[PDB]
Structures are given as structure tokens and as C-alpha cells.
């Protein structure tokens, strides 16, 4: 019923001794919410300033108590009192005061569902606006990866709440420096030491965050202490990833008995630059060059000719001969039928037109300076309906590089394993038709690269390594816009290899409709759970009408097994015969499905599934049935 619960602390009065704190609660339509039964001041705190506990030391939140004692004022406002405020007798009205207010998800008496809500607000010692703050990060950055509104590890859903409990005082009281939040947060994302009573090595977190400070530390003229990540070096925080130094013993570093001198040597400019230098340099290299690609079909040979034009940052022609010795790889993959690929993985046309500065004999650089290549595999154009009139070609490429500069590829046999020696560049996509009519294109309206980049960054070099140059996905291969006129960067090019017939093995669930789900349900569940909205804005259920069979298994003789397309898509996570699927194979067949059968049988029955008579999935709730 209630979609968003907003909370504001509207009044703080110390006239009776302890503070009386009034909270106003509204819904998404700014209407007052009456009847909250689980509202609480989870923490009352005050701010010991930067350096007060010692030179170079951080500011600290000192505890003043908590309260679940409030009156519902029957107008959207609620007033708290404290039964035992400041039991430690440390209250100081010269300090900034903070209140952390939480409302548990649940149902108002009338049965109205109410979602969780959390907030903090800061004041001076009389309830006016605060004079100074410790605002370094905000909850929004975590939501780029962790599902907004769900608990992050435990206890709460917003970082300010974690920060309000995991304080220096908290850590000191337990004799455990590592549980102070500014140590913990880096610890749990970095694999140099394990964490928890379970000794978990953060392998997955490390591979996503990659120690990149800017995924959480965003400079902003909203958070006045945002630059603290580089301006306040301390042994307590810096040791979270730098785990082998003993400052006390003077091992692996000069002896430092306190934090008095860290900033004198570790100046802010240096700390900020050093931790961000590699990603900054890589992003600079990626944006040095681009490509613009065309494809045409020879109406008589029915082969496709792909032409690639390198351009500079201003989009000005660069003759490929001039940078050829620095091109590490350029690869071109062509399939047919962008809505239901027809050639399979084994039947696709593919070539490394360039490897380590050298042109393949099948590719040439023409007099206008473009690379030109003509397909050699049977593209079977027009052999499978109107969609098969269209060939689509994916171009990926890389340039050799060292320490932020492009360099010559001096080793023709360089295998691409050492990713520090080259940079994947912006990939491209080109369409051509046998008929000469406009090309068909795949829907790109349900998932796009912007969603992938929330976790992997915009500079994600997909598949970079021994097997591929690294595909960087950008507006270069956009062919449509959203309702707002923003270019959509689709993943439709990936279908060149991620075909309905699978990838190199029929046991991989390689089709694109299955592969992203399989990889992420297996390895990203700790982050995403069942949150389809992590990737999807919508489900394009109409797209199923353009699909045929999808490969779902390998037979014992290693031949391919296939399912009708809706069943195939759902069963990636809901394996037939497992505890994750109630419908038996017999029942699914009674709904028109083919389950791990022949390609012919699955193709014939592809538009015979009755699943959507009952199932009405939306991204908000994919489990919905009539
Ligand atoms: C906000 C969403 C968070 C997050 C991300 C974490 N916490 Fe807590 N936490 C609390 C207590 C009493 C402990 C045990 C400490 C001990 O071992 O003595 C923890 C522990 C953790 C861990 C494990 C850290 C480790 O190195 O072992 C982690 C990763 C963690 N928390 C994350 C208590 C609280 C709260 C008290 C009201 C609040 C709020 C939070 N935690 C919030 C969060
Ligand atoms: C105050 C207690 C600190 C803290 C928290 C750190 N330092 Fe230093 N440090 C200095 C030099 C010349 C180096 C080597 C530079 C380099 O490797 O490029 C370091 C190294 C570090 C590290 C990184 C350790 C690593 O090998 O990765 C860290 C995390 C670190 N320091 C923290 C020089 C100085 C000083 C000059 C006399 C002073 C004082 C400090 N550092 C103080 C601190
Ligand atoms: C948008 C549809 C995409 C695409 C194309 C990819 N991702 Fe993710 N990803 C996430 C996590 C936690 C992992 C596992 C990391 C690990 O186990 O070390 C992955 C893995 C991948 C890969 C494998 C290569 C790699 O970098 O590990 C690939 C190719 C890939 N993904 C593509 C996390 C997320 C998200 C967090 C909510 C989001 C969103 C995405 N990924 C989105 C996409
Ligand atoms: C992507 C660049 C992330 C951002 C931004 C934040 N987190 Fe994260 N976190 C991320 C991953 C891939 C993982 C590992 C998940 C897994 O299955 O291993 C984590 C892990 C944590 C943890 C430990 C719990 C765990 O699941 O291992 C915590 C406590 C945590 N993250 C907290 C957290 C906070 C508070 C963030 C905002 C400051 C935050 N993370 C951002 C990826 C990313
Ligand atoms: C999210 C997964 C983070 C990443 C990646 C990095 N930092 Fe961080 N840092 C994060 C949080 C939630 C906090 C606590 C903020 C608070 O209000 O308490 C911090 C804190 C720091 C600090 C302490 C600043 C202070 O005033 O004491 C430092 C020095 C710091 N972080 C440094 C730092 C560096 C150098 C990083 C890249 C290697 C980095 N952080 C990444 C969250 C996250
Ligand atoms: C994990 C999120 C880290 C935190 C917290 C801190 N550092 Fe760091 N540090 C980290 C990485 C991944 C690297 C390698 C950077 C590179 O690309 O070379 C470093 C490196 C340093 C260095 C240079 C050491 C070297 O190998 O040449 C220094 C001097 C350094 N870090 C200092 C430093 C300080 C002062 C920190 C607290 C403010 C700090 N680091 C935190 C990862 C992480
Ligand atoms: C052929 C040149 C490919 C293109 C173009 C793309 N991918 Fe790929 N991918 C390919 C192979 C041979 C494999 C391994 C076999 C398998 O099916 O798993 C993959 C694998 C993936 C995975 C899984 C990764 C894992 O660690 O398990 C993902 C998530 C994936 N591929 C995604 C993906 C995307 C988004 C692409 C377009 C940018 C893409 N692939 C293109 C081969 C090829
Ligand atoms: C990113 C890791 C994703 C998550 C999380 C979820 N889905 Fe997804 N989905 C993803 C991709 C790359 C594709 C292929 C798009 C294409 O061009 O083939 C899909 C596809 C679907 C579909 C097919 C309809 C469509 O919109 O294309 C469905 C019905 C679907 N996905 C459902 C679904 C559900 C129910 C999810 C949460 C449990 C979910 N997806 C998460 C990527 C990702
Ligand atoms: C992984 C990306 C999934 C895809 C693809 C599909 N579903 Fe799903 N589903 C997924 C999860 C993680 C869960 C929660 C499991 C649990 O803990 O209970 C679900 C759940 C459902 C349900 C509710 C289960 C029940 O009580 O019956 C339904 C009805 C459901 N899913 C339907 C469904 C359909 C029709 C799908 C294809 C369009 C589909 N799911 C795909 C994960 C994933
Ligand atoms: C009505 C006669 C249905 C038809 C036709 C199909 N499904 Fe179904 N399904 C139905 C119900 C009532 C449920 C349970 C809902 C709940 O909330 O408990 C389901 C469940 C599923 C699931 C989730 C399974 C699980 O998590 O255990 C999936 C993935 C699913 N159904 C898929 C599916 C397919 C592929 C269908 C067409 C072949 C199909 N369903 C038809 C009701 C009905
Ligand atoms: Ca207020
Ligand atoms: Ca909030
Ligand atoms: Ca760690
Ligand atoms: Ca283009
Ligand atoms: Ca039909």
C-alpha cells in the first residue's frame, strides 16, 4: 500500500533536560502517515571533533542512548522522550547532536503495508541547525550495488545507521578495533585479510570493487567532509587493506606510535592520486579513439563485407595504418537474425582481423584507411524468415599499452593473458540486409548497459583476456532511444555468440536469455538475491513471439537438447526436477512446453506455451499469477 515512508525530525527541544524529539512521517504522495507502531530513535549521538582525541585522529560519534517511547500525535507527527538519556553523563551542548530514526517494515492496524525507513539528522546542542558535521559518504552509493531497501549484511538498510552503531566508542568498548565502521567497510570489500567469525575471504567483493575508492567516495558539494578519504590518513583505517604493516613495531614502515604525522608525508593530493591513477589512465586511453562500422551484403554471393573506420576523440578520421603497430587485436563476429540468431556458435563467422600489429591475410586496409573484411561462412541469409534477412556484426578491439600510454605490440605471439599490457576499446555493431530493406534489430528496452555499469563501471572490458580483446560497451552501438531521448546501449550485440544454440558446449546455457541469469544467480546472489530490477527496467514479454527453441542441455552423446522459449528462460533459476520448481516436466508439457527435447520439437512448439495465461510477471513482482 505505502510505497515510500519519509521521515523528518521537525523539532528537538531540550527545555525539560533530556531532548524531546518530534518526527513527521509521510508517504510517497506527501500525505501524513498515522499509526506507526515500530518507530524508534535507534541511537542518539554527539560529535567529538576532528583531532580532539589526538592529533590526526578522526572525529567520533559518542553515545547518548536510544528510545522506543513515543506518542502518536494523530496528525503524522510522533513525539519521543527518553527514560534514561545520557546514562554516561557525557552530554555537551557545545557539540553537534545526531539522532538515528528507524521505522520497521510492517502493517498499520487497518492492514496497510508500510516499508522500512531509516534516516539521521544533525542539530546543535539546543536543537537548531548544526555548526559542524562529519558527512563523508551517503547511503546512495551503496545502492549502486546492494539492493536498496534490503538489509546490507545485517541490522539495517542504510549506511548512516551502520555508522551510528559501529562507532569508535563501540569498538573500544569491545576491545576490537576492527569493528569500527571505517575499518570494517574497507575490510569487507578487500581480500588481503579475511573477516568475521567465519573467516570469509572477500574474493567476490574484491573482484567487483577492486579497491576503487570512487565507488563510495564521491566528492560532492552536499557532503562537506567528502574529501576525508584522502585528507585524514590514520593507522586505524589505512591498515584495513594494508594488513602487513606494524606501525608500532616499525615493521614494513617507519615506526609510528600515533597518527600525529601521517598527513605530513601522506599529503591529500598523493593519497587521492595514487589509489585512482590506474583507472583514471585506463579511462583516458579508452576515450582516445573510437570506431564507426558499416556492413553491406553482396546480393549475389550473399557474403557480408565489414568496413571499420577509426576516429579520434572529436570523431575525426584516423587512417588505420598510422596506429596498426599498436592494435593488439581486432575481432569481427557475424551472426544472422538479430531477434532469434540462426547460425549458432559453431556456424557464426568470426575472425581476428588483427593480432599484435599484424593483419590477417583475409583483412586489408583500403586506400581510404578503413579495415575491410568479407565473411567466409555461409550466412544462410533469408533461409529462416524475415528476421534472417538481417546479418549483424560485432566488432571488438584492443590497443597495446603501458603505464597510461599506447605502445607498440612488440611480441607477435602475445597471448593476451597479462591484462596490464593492453586496453580493450569501444566496441561496435553493424547491420546489413540481403534484400536492401531496413534491417531488423533486437529489442533493447528491458535491460541495458547502464544497469551493468552500476556494478561493473562504464569502463567494463567484457571478456578481456586470452580469448578476447575486451568489449567496452558505449553509444557507438546504440540504435534507439528511451522515452526521454537518452541513447540506449543494448546488449544485443552479445547474441552473435550467445545464440539460441548456446555457446561452445550445449551444456552451458549459453543463449543470452539464459546466460546472464545463470552467471548472476550462481555468483551474484549474495548481492542481488531475486532483485530483477538490478538489471531490468521492464520485461519484454512480447519478444517471446519472435523466439524459437532455446538450448537448455546436452544429451549423453553431447548433441544439443532444447526447450520452448518461456520454459527455457524461467528454468535457468527454476531447474526442472529440483526443489526450485513445483511444476513437474509432465505438467509443463501439458502447458505446451518442450523440456530438454530435440531442436525440431522445441521449434515446432515454440509458440504453443500457455504460461502467460496464468503468469503475469512484472519487474516489481515477477512471481505474480492471476
Ligand atoms: C549497516 C547496514 C551495518 C552493516 C553493513 C554492518 N553492521 Fe554490524 N555489528 C553489530 C555487532 C554487535 C557486531 C558484532 C561485533 C563483534 O564481533 O563484537 C556486528 C558485526 C558486523 C560485521 C562483522 C565484522 C567483523 O569483522 O566481524 C559486519 C560486516 C557488520 N556488522 C556490518 C552491531 C550493529 C548495529 C547495532 C545497533 C548496527 C546498526 C549495525 N551493526 C549495522 C551494520
Ligand atoms: C601515520 C600513522 C601513517 C600512516 C597511517 C601511513 N603512513 Fe606512511 N609511508 C611513507 C613512505 C615513504 C611510504 C612508501 C611509499 C610507497 O610505497 O610508495 C609509506 C607507506 C605507507 C603505506 C603503504 C604501504 C605499502 O607498502 O603499500 C601506508 C598505508 C602508510 N604508509 C600509512 C612515509 C611516511 C612518513 C614519513 C616520515 C610518515 C610520518 C608516515 N608515512 C606516516 C604514516
Ligand atoms: C548487465 C546485464 C551485466 C552484465 C552484462 C554483467 N553483469 Fe555482473 N557480476 C556481479 C557479480 C557480484 C559477479 C561475480 C564476480 C565474481 O564472482 O568475482 C559478476 C560477474 C559478471 C561477469 C564475469 C566477469 C567478472 O567481471 O567477474 C560478467 C561478464 C558480468 N558479470 C556481466 C554483479 C553485477 C551487478 C550487481 C547488482 C550487476 C547489475 C551486474 N553484475 C550486471 C551485469
Ligand atoms: C559495488 C562497486 C559495491 C558497492 C558500491 C558497495 N558494495 Fe558492499 N559488496 C559488494 C560485493 C560484490 C560484496 C560481496 C557480496 C558477496 O556475495 O560476497 C559486498 C559485500 C559487502 C559486505 C559483506 C557482506 C557480504 O555479502 O560479504 C558488506 C558489509 C557491505 N558490502 C557493505 C557495503 C556498504 C555499507 C556499502 C556502501 C558504503 C557498500 N557495501 C557498497 C559490492 C559493493
Ligand atoms: C565503499 C565500499 C568504500 C570504498 C570502496 C572505499 N571507502 Fe573509505 N569509507 C567508506 C565508508 C562508509 C567510510 C565511513 C564514513 C564515516 O562517516 O564514518 C569510509 C571512511 C574512510 C576514511 C576515514 C575518514 C575519516 O574522517 O576518518 C578513509 C581515510 C577512507 N575511507 C579511505 C579510503 C580509500 C583510500 C579508499 C580507496 C583505496 C576507500 N576509502 C574506499 C566506504 C568506502
Ligand atoms: C583498500 C580499499 C585500501 C585502503 C583502505 C587504503 N589503500 Fe593504499 N593501496 C591500496 C591499493 C589497491 C594500492 C595499490 C595502488 C596501485 O595501483 O599501485 C595501494 C597503495 C598504496 C600506496 C603505494 C604503495 C605501493 O604499492 O606503491 C600508498 C603509499 C598507500 N596505498 C597509502 C594508503 C593510505 C595512507 C591509506 C589510508 C588513507 C590507504 N592507503 C588506504 C588499497 C587501499
Ligand atoms: C564470442 C566472441 C562472444 C561474444 C561476442 C560474447 N561472449 Fe560471453 N561468453 C563467450 C564464451 C565462449 C563464454 C563461455 C561459455 C559460456 O557459455 O559460459 C562466455 C561466457 C559469458 C558469461 C559467463 C561468465 C562466467 O564467468 O561464467 C557471461 C556473463 C557473458 N559471457 C556475457 C557476455 C556479454 C554481456 C556479452 C556482450 C557484451 C558477451 N558475453 C559477448 C563468448 C562470447
Ligand atoms: C542482470 C544480471 C539480470 C538480472 C539480475 C535479471 N536479468 Fe533477466 N535478462 C538479463 C539479460 C541480459 C536478458 C537478455 C535480453 C535479450 O536481449 O535476450 C534477460 C532477459 C530476461 C527475460 C526475457 C524477456 C526480455 O525482457 O528480454 C525475462 C522474462 C527475464 N530476463 C526475467 C528475469 C527475472 C524474472 C529476473 C529476476 C528473478 C531477472 N530476469 C533478473 C539480465 C538480467
Ligand atoms: C533467476 C534470474 C530467475 C529467473 C530467470 C526466474 N526466477 Fe522466479 N524466482 C527466482 C527467485 C530467487 C525466487 C524466490 C525463491 C524463494 O525463496 O521462494 C523466485 C520465485 C518465483 C515464484 C514464487 C515461488 C512460489 O512460491 O511458487 C514464482 C511464481 C516465479 N519465481 C515465477 C517465475 C517465472 C514464471 C519465471 C520465468 C518468466 C521466473 N520465475 C524466472 C529467480 C528467478
Ligand atoms: C495456471 C494453470 C498456470 C500455468 C498455465 C503455468 N503456471 Fe507456473 N505456476 C502457477 C502457480 C499457481 C505457481 C505457484 C505460485 C505461487 O506463488 O506459489 C506457479 C509456479 C511457477 C514457477 C515458480 C516455481 C517455484 O519457485 O517452485 C515457475 C518458474 C513457473 N510456474 C513456470 C511456469 C512455466 C514455464 C509455465 C508454462 C510452461 C507455467 N508456469 C504455466 C500456475 C501456472
Ligand atoms: Ca528536520
Ligand atoms: Ca532513508
Ligand atoms: Ca579484508
Ligand atoms: Ca556504430
Ligand atoms: Ca500461440
Numbering used by the authors: 45 to 670
Excerpt from the publication:
The mtr operon includes the genes to express three proteins: a decaheme cytochrome MtrA that inserts into the periplasmic side of a 28-strand transmembrane β-barrel MtrB9, and an outer membrane decaheme cytochrome MtrC that inserts into the extracellular side of MtrB. The outer membrane cytochromes MtrC, OmcA and MtrF are exported to the extracellular cell surface by the type II secretion system and S. oneidensis ΔomcA-ΔmtrC double mutants are severely compromised for respiratory mineral Fe(III) reduction and electron transfer to anodes in microbial fuel cells. Here we demonstrate a reversible transition of MtrC between cytochrome and flavocytochrome states that is controlled by the redox state of a conserved disulphide. All structures are formed of 4 domains, two multiheme domains that are flanked by two β-barrels with β-strands arranged in Greek key motifs.
Alignment of the MtrC heme iron atoms with the iron atoms of UndA, MtrF and OmcA reveals that the heme arrangement of MtrC has a closer homology to MtrF with an r.m.s.d of 1.7 Å, than to UndA or OmcA with an r.m.s.d. of 2.1 Å. The conserved cysteines 444 and 453 of the CX8C motif form a single disulfide within domain III of MtrC. However, in domain III there is a hydrophobic cleft next to heme 7 that contains three phenylalanines, which in the UndA is occupied by an extra heme. The closest heme group to the MtrC disulfide is heme 7, suggesting that FMN would associate somewhere on domain III, in close proximity to heme 7. In the fumarate reductase of S. oneidensis MR-1 the edge-to-edge distance between the flavin cofactor and the nearest heme group is 7.5 Å, and this distance would place the MtrC flavin binding site approximately halfway between heme 7 and the disulfide bond.
